[PDB]
Amino acid sequence: QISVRGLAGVENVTELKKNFNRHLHFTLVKDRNVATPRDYYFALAHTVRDHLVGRWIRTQQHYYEKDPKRIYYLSLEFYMGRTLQNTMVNLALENACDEATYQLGLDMEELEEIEEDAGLGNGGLGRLAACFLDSMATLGLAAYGYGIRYEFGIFNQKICGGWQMEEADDWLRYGNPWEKARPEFTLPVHFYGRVEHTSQGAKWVDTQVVLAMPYDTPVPGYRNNVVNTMRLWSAKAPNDFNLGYIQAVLDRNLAENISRVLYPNDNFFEGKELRLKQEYFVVAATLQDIIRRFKSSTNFDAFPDKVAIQLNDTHPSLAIPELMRVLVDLERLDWDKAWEVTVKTCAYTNHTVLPEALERWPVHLLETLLPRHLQIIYEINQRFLNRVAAAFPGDVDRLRRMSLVEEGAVKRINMAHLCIAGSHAVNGVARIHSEILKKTIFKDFYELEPHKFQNKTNGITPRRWLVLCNPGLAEIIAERIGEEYISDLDQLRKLLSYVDDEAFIRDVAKVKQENKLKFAAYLEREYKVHINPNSLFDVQVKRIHEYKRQLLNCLHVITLYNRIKKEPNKFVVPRTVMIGGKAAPGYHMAKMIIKLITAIGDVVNHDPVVGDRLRVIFLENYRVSLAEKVIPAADLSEQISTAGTEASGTGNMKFMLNGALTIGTMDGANVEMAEEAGEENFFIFGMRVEDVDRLDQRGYNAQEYYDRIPELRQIIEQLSSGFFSPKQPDLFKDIVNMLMHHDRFKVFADYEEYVKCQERVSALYKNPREWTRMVIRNIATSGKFSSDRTIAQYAREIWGVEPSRQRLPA
Amino acid sequence: QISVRGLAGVENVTELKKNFNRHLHFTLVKDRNVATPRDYYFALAHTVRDHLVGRWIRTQQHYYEKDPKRIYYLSLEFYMGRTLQNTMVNLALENACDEATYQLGLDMEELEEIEEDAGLGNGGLGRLAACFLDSMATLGLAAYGYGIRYEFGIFNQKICGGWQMEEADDWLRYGNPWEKARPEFTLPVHFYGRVEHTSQGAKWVDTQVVLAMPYDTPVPGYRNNVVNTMRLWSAKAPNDFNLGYIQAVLDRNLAENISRVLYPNDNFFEGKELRLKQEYFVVAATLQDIIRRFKSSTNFDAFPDKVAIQLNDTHPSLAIPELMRVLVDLERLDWDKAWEVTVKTCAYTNHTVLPEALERWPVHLLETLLPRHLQIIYEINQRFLNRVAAAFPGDVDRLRRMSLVEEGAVKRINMAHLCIAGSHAVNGVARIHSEILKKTIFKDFYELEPHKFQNKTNGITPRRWLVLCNPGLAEIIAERIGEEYISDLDQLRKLLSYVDDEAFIRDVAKVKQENKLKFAAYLEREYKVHINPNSLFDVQVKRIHEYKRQLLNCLHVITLYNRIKKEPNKFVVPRTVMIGGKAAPGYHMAKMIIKLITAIGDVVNHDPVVGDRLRVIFLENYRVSLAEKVIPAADLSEQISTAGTEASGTGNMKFMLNGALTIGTMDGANVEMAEEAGEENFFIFGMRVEDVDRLDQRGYNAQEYYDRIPELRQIIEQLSSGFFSPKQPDLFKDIVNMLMHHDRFKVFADYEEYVKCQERVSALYKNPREWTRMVIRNIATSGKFSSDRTIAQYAREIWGVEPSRQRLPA
Numbered sequence A, B: 001q002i003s004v005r006g007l008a009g010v011e012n013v014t015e016l017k018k019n020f021n022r023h024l025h026f027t028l029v030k031d032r033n034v035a036t037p038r039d040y041y042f043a044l045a046h047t048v049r050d051h052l053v054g055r056w057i058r059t060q061q062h063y064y065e066k067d068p069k070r071i072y073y074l075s076l077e078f079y080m081g082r083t084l085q086n087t088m089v090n091l092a093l094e095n096a097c098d099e100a101t102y103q104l105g106l107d108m109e110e111l112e113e114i115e116e117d118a119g120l121g122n123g124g125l126g127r128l129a130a131c132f133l134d135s136m137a138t139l140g141l142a143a144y145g146y147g148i149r150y151e152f153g154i155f156n157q158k159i160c161g162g163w164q165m166e167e168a169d170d171w172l173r174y175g176n177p178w179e180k181a182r183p184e185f186t187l188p189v190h191f192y193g194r195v196e197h198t199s200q201g202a203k204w205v206d207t208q209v210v211l212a213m214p215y216d217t218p219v220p221g222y223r224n225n226v227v228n229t230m231r232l233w234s235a236k237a238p239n240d241f242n243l244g245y246i247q248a249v250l251d252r253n254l255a256e257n258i259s260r261v262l263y264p265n266d267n268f269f270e271g272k273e274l275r276l277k278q279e280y281f282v283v284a285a286t287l288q289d290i291i292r293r294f295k296s297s298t299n300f301d302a303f304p305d306k307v308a309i310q311l312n313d314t315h316p317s318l319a320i321p322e323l324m325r326v327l328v329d330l331e332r333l334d335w336d337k338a339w340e341v342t343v344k345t346c347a348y349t350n351h352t353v354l355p356e357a358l359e360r361w362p363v364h365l366l367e368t369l370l371p372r373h374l375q376i377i378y379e380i381n382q383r384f385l386n387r388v389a390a391a392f393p394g395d396v397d398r399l400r401r402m403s404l405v406e407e408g409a410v411k412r413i414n415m416a417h418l419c420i421a422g423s424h425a426v427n428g429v430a431r432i433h434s435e436i437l438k439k440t441i442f443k444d445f446y447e448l449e450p451h452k453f454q455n456k457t458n459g460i461t462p463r464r465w466l467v468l469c470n471p472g473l474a475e476i477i478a479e480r481i482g483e484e485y486i487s488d489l490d491q492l493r494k495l496l497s498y499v500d501d502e503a504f505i506r507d508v509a510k511v512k513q514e515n516k517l518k519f520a521a522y523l524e525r526e527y528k529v530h531i532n533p534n535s536l537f538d539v540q541v542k543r544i545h546e547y548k549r550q551l552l553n554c555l556h557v558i559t560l561y562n563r564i565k566k567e568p569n570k571f572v573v574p575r576t577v578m579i580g581g582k583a584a585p586g587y588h589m590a591k592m593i594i595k596l597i598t599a600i601g602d603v604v605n606h607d608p609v610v611g612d613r614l615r616v617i618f619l620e621n622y623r624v625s626l627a628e629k630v631i632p633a634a635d636l637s638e639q640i641s642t643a644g645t646e647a648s649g650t651g652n653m654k655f656m657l658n659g660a661l662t663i664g665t666m667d668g669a670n671v672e673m674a675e676e677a678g679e680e681n682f683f684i685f686g687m688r689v690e691d692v693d694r695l696d697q698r699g700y701n702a703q704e705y706y707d708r709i710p711e712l713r714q715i716i717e718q719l720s721s722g723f724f725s726p727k728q729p730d731l732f733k734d735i736v737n738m739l740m741h742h743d744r745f746k747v748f749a750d751y752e753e754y755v756k757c758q759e760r761v762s763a764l765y766k767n768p769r770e771w772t773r774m775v776i777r778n779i780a781t782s783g784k785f786s787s788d789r790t791i792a793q794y795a796r797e798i799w800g801v802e803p804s805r806q807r808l809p810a
């Protein structure tokens, strides 16, 4: 149908149809008369997978021969989403497969919907890893994603009576055709035990063994025939484990629990033993694999020339003392050599400054679980503090602040301090965030080792987040400027010379309207709710957090409602306000916010006087595949975190790419986005970082805002008095109390400026031509936020490898 | 190479080679330069499996169209062994695959050895089910095996210091290419709850739901293009199960434990809740499946015309009250109609008279777990006892004896009594056993309903147990009489006219010697032990049990040793005495017997004076694939159970088929075997059933035998004094004490006759021509013990279906 989806040659279509039927018969053991759409999806998935494996074998082969430097991306999360369409896009098979399935009387688009998301992530951090893998493959880097194959990913969210209920994401129920189990590369991982010191050095003994079995998933690059590997480890008990009999067999589950379930906390630290086991598990198995692959190139001087290990936050920070343990205890290098190798090999990306997200493991946990690693951590700390003392003699407070070990009732290890000490590069994820690291939480570390600290602003892959999710927009862009932009997104700047072209303005707006029609229809089919598609689509989708200020959005929504009730017969630009996202299961306040959102919806959506002028919709089970549907449909993107709290954000970039205007604070990557588009093409409001600091210095008094703003007072009175919860008048007392007395994120401080800025948005939406011209200016300057740019910067400035756009042979 | 292995056409070989490489590349994602033998096995297994699926789809299709009566074989055990070679044999692919693998530079025989046994059984009962499935498919019956897909089968046995250690049989580690998961046919199974009685009848409510997910394995018939299904259920938790969060997800294991592990007790009852859950699980899921398939033919009069359910012992006895529950509570038939249907549908095979093996479930278990089934069982009991009272008025003892509910401190349900009451046919498994059922344990039931009671003597499949495991013997037989005997084993009688043919005598003996060379070599390679292959191979392989009297064998072995030490320079026919088998993990006495066997070995095998005249070898990890190796190698088969205790035996039949002579008691199917071969061609010794009874009446005094037999006294003194355990002088005090004071199986009563009979065996072995002529007379009359004969009898006399040897189209 459309250009960017590739050729549909007669032979290629013929061969796909043939292989579809071969898989249906032989692989699935089905005849055509009993096959369900699920069977057809699987038959298609197996036929597409066949086109990967030649390239996969050939790529891994090539890396063995050429022996390039190898990048290992360690993360506890990889939020991959669906693989089928992305694989088709990257192999130029999408039109051929659509044609092939069409001739068999099947609609590929409905088969795509049957695929389960691989939800092995919480949100931004996990998705960044997935986007990074795609960019690494697209840029020809010999890169490996290493993580955990969780049996259960991020929970599926049901709304019941307006409350979040969680249910297990049993994503492997029907099988995963994309993965290949590799039981032959199973590795032992050790826990507990104790340390003996011999004359031959320290020796970790009497350990519990858990086996790590790898599963490999292909990661195809964009049209370059490169297929990299994501290797995910699964926990398996050894066969002599616990070996009355029956119970011993049943107790194998205790070991296999390690890989059972993703911890569902976004931007929050829960210090549980099972979590620490997960972190060591992925680190230990991965490093053995790294070292084994390295020894097929006993001299570790060249280790950092052949190996880069990137730590995705502190979650795999134990790679540092683990690498030391292997090099010192097993390989018998001296400490200083091993440390040189370790630092030159490792690099740390920080993703948050919120103190409740920082990993600080109690020493008693580490002492019990990983006694040798704790010894090595103490030794690292001592030698590090000796360098600090020598650089800053007499500054004993600095020594206390910089220590890897923090004192208190509970002694803890600060894993961020470990990462900084044991890495040659430390980077934040947007310019303002990287600056905040140097000025606040890591100021001491910056003063000692200024050279370590870098910025690598985040990005998103334009394959998934444009070509895949918004083909109509990709096509009209490709009509004017060609297809090269898909792997060189800076080329979107050429769209600035179409900002006054009437045809392009019309096409940009037509695609947006088509996406909105399609999403409005999707809402009606799957969740029985009617949406006016002529309304402005005001969307805030992201995990539910106090710092992300879905509550601020809620306050605007109730303001628009109160204004309509005040002057019912005045014109107002209609809006569909959509808010979606998961709350962590134990985050009480986040769960209350969801309940408030749906409670507002219950009042607003059923008021006859409102009509279709204002709808509030809670989008259930926000996940990667729902982001692919709703982001192309959005007009207004809500990026309204308190300044200084959102490290980067990446949802923000997805919306910019897909023709939505942004209302947001000068936080995270919003600052760079506005800078790229021009501030005049962005709805910027609220406190800057500097204003938040000033307000902290004198003290944040929310009562002041409540006293001075009648419109705000009315809302707080409505919440308190039971206007939004008639049967439970005091249901939201915790929310009010927090907003008045304990609001860390200063919701009221930004209320007035937010509502005024929202008025300017509405004014511009009344003039479609100028709205769409502003949209074009956004889309055209979104090139910087390609993860290809991000990865090229990692490669050149941290890993020391040159990226490449050149094709492997097919 | 050999005829019975089929044709190796040029095109057929070419196509297998092509598909081997296709699977290696696409399915396994391996190049030739990194493939291990395991990869090659898997590539072959996938290529052979491809030849099944057309026939599989076509067979299930055919049964949908023709709608024959369907046989459901319910068992908790299916001891399948390896599938690869059996599949090749039954599809006539063995020579083509051997040629195809040869041309790729691979030895098929070493690839076969990589396949794991499917060890979802303990011994005889589980193997009978596997043999039955093969025969059902070979005879064109529309038959389904229904069981549990245990993650862990019968434990792997290691010997450590002469003691059995158990380790988990992780048979699915590397994947099972033979199975097809069918998550789409997942069914709910209910547990716990309580019963409400409404006006609309009884209602089972507040239940815990466990999901049953089926996995299908093909069961190919012998060269008839019929492929039946074995459907095995796996336990899965529902996604709202337990739904703080993490723990709820981790607790999904509590439900999935149901299918985790096979209970490893042979011929013994352990009344554990997990076992009862397994029994209900397989019954509940299976019956829903039966009923669903039936409703695609609301009138249940025709149910028994379309459905036969065979109960493999009492293990799936809950099928009876479950079928009632569905028909009465859900389908709303009246009780008497439902009962008619149930009885006409169900049939029960008894497999043991040992009282410790009989399932007697405590009422408190059933009351908690299956409260509705207990109500139905009481109702069944009441109406049954009303029939007994009316037939035998005033016989109140009979009422007490026949009750399904037995009184005592603990009230129990006698599940055998339930099966008899709720089945139209009850059969034993060998003629003497079926007679014992009518004269002793079920005498009362026989008097009430004589028509129910039948015999169906066991059999073994000659595909696995001759063609597959002993190709050389199959070939020389096929040279003289053709190949038709493989599916019509009675044709082996034609071999009686070659009993005086010098060429055939020589070939029969040559094959035996070749099998012995091959097995002696196997022993040396895999377990570093040297065996004289000119010696007589005296083998006892079967589960370790007191009733099977491995101890009697031990006493003979020590007798031969003591005789050699007494007269060292006298000639003795050399023997390799091989004993193998697993002890149930909690069966202390069985574990001691293993230790005695290895202890005897330690003394005997290291005595210079003995030389290679006597070796005692404990065969480790006796399983189906080891039976395939050792049984063809055997000269003497030891079937030495106390008369009346071995229901049938099936090892006995395997040895008869493969050219071994039998030394045994008149027990189980030995009686019919001797009757077929002639008593003169069988080494029969010991008490008959009648003699055991007489000895019980007056009382078994073991001291009498110890006092009268000096040779026996010496052995008991050697055991007691520490001759066989020098470092632990009293190690075997429990064995001695049992033999002298508490021997239920009368080992000493048969000692004298056993040793004399063993002398006659040795005498005959000195004359090879006459040994081999006796062997021919055994092989030639082993036809009755084909499971094809057994299944044809089930089909005609119980199920009411006609078997067929005719081919489906290819």
Ligand SMILES: O=c1[nH]cnc2c1ncn2[C@@H]1O[C@@H](COP(=O)(O)O)[C@@H](O)[C@H]1O
Pocket (backbone or CB within 6 Å): A057, A060, A061, A064, A293, B031, B033, B034
């Ligand atoms: O000894 C060898 N000969 C040829 N290729 C090899 C050898 N060892 C590794 N390779 C290649 O590199 C491997 C990639 O997987 P890795 O061992 O995880 O790096 C294989 O898939 C081969 O393509």
Ligand SMILES: O=c1[nH]cnc2c1ncn2[C@@H]1O[C@@H](COP(=O)(O)O)[C@@H](O)[C@H]1O
Pocket (backbone or CB within 6 Å): A031, A033, A034, B057, B060, B061, B064, B293
């Ligand atoms: O509606 C139908 N049309 C055609 N074939 C059917 C239909 N329902 C069942 N079958 C056949 O019978 C089935 C055998 O599996 P079953 O449903 O477990 O008996 C399928 O594999 C089909 O071959």
Ligand SMILES: N[C@@H]1[C@@H](O)[C@H](O)[C@@H](CO)O[C@H]1c1nnc(-c2ccccc2)[nH]1
Pocket (backbone or CB within 6 Å): A122, A124, A125, A128, A265, A266, A267, A268, A269, A351, A352, A357, A429, A458, A646, A647, A648, A649, A650, A668
């Ligand atoms: N909030 C930031 C986002 O601003 C950022 O865009 C994303 C990727 O850098 O990382 C997110 C992130 N930071 N910490 C986590 C985190 C911490 C602990 C567990 C799970 C996720 N995620």
Ligand SMILES: N[C@@H]1[C@@H](O)[C@H](O)[C@@H](CO)O[C@H]1c1nnc(-c2ccccc2)[nH]1
Pocket (backbone or CB within 6 Å): B122, B124, B125, B128, B265, B266, B267, B268, B269, B351, B352, B357, B429, B458, B646, B647, B648, B649, B650, B668
């Ligand atoms: N001992 C008999 C054998 O004599 C018989 O050959 C076999 C098949 O009928 O069944 C065996 C058997 N009987 N009961 C069991 C059993 C009972 C409980 C659990 C597992 C197996 N197995």
Ligand SMILES: *Cc1c(COP(=O)(O)O)cnc(C)c1O
Pocket (backbone or CB within 6 Å): A122, A123, A124, A127, A541, A542, A543, A622, A623, A624, A627, A648, A649, A650, A651, A652, A654
């Ligand atoms: C991109 C993405 C996120 C991150 O969004 P932010 O607005 O940066 O928090 C979270 N969840 C999903 C499913 C995503 O695709």
Ligand SMILES: *Cc1c(COP(=O)(O)O)cnc(C)c1O
Pocket (backbone or CB within 6 Å): B122, B123, B124, B127, B541, B542, B543, B622, B623, B624, B627, B648, B649, B650, B651, B652, B654
């Ligand atoms: C046939 C068989 C049995 C049953 O043997 P008996 O001598 O009848 O107890 C037990 N185990 C295996 C592995 C078998 O193949």
